[PDB]
Design a binder for this molecule. Structure first.
Ligand SMILES: OC[C@H]1O[C@@H](S[C@@H]2O[C@H](CO)[C@@H](O)[C@H](O)[C@H]2O)[C@H](O)[C@@H](n2cc(-c3ccccc3)nn2)[C@H]1O
Ligand SMILES: [Cl-]
Length: 138
């Protein structure tokens, strides 16, 4: 088991062909989860499942620059379930982060922060039991 919030160092930043894998279980009465790919205090890619935003389940993605959030990206598919185990895979591609949950493609997020080799940490927070977090090159 890992302690949440968890920091996964990404030595030398991210690069295309780098695959991040996160395994955990959603807590039974979960409200929120976040992955934060960070460049110092900036958040290059925030991936934020919300289980109860006005009685709707939605994933919000965004970037934080100089402490300001930008334009949110929202789509409707919500593959997480309270109480159940999940796998998140984040593949860095040249133009975007590509995210799959439980082996099904979910969304892509275009790179707004373009100094990929300075995105040197991943924070994992919110209403999960975190089993493992790691990376490999494909
Ligand atoms: O844009 C992404 C951010 O949105 C805000 S909320 C936002 O606020 C605007 C101004 O009022 C409204 O215009 C808009 O409609 C509404 O969506 C949210 O607080 C931010 N946030 C989430 C977390 C967090 C922490 C721990 C675990 C999980 C998540 N930390 N910061 C982060 O998601
Ligand atoms: Cl939230």
């Amino acid at each position: 088991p890992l302690i949440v919030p968890y920091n996964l160092p990404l030595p030398g930043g991210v690069v295309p062909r780098m695959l991040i894998t996160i395994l955990g279980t959603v807590k039974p009465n979960a409200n929120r989860i976040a992955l934060d790919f960070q460049r110092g205090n900036d958040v290059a890619f925030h991936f934020n499942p919300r289980f109860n935003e006005n009685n709707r389940r939605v994933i919000v993605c965004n970037t934080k620059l100089d402490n300001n959030w930008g334009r949110e990206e929202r789509q409707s598919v919500f593959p997480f379930e309270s109480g159940k185990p999940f796998k998140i895979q984040v593949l860095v591609e040249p133009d975007h982060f590509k995210v799959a949950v439980n082996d099904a493609h979910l969304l892509q997020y275009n790179h707004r922060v373009k100094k990929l080799n300075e995105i040197s940490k991943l924070g994992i927070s919110g209403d999960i039991d975190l089993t493992s977090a790691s990376y490999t090159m494909i």
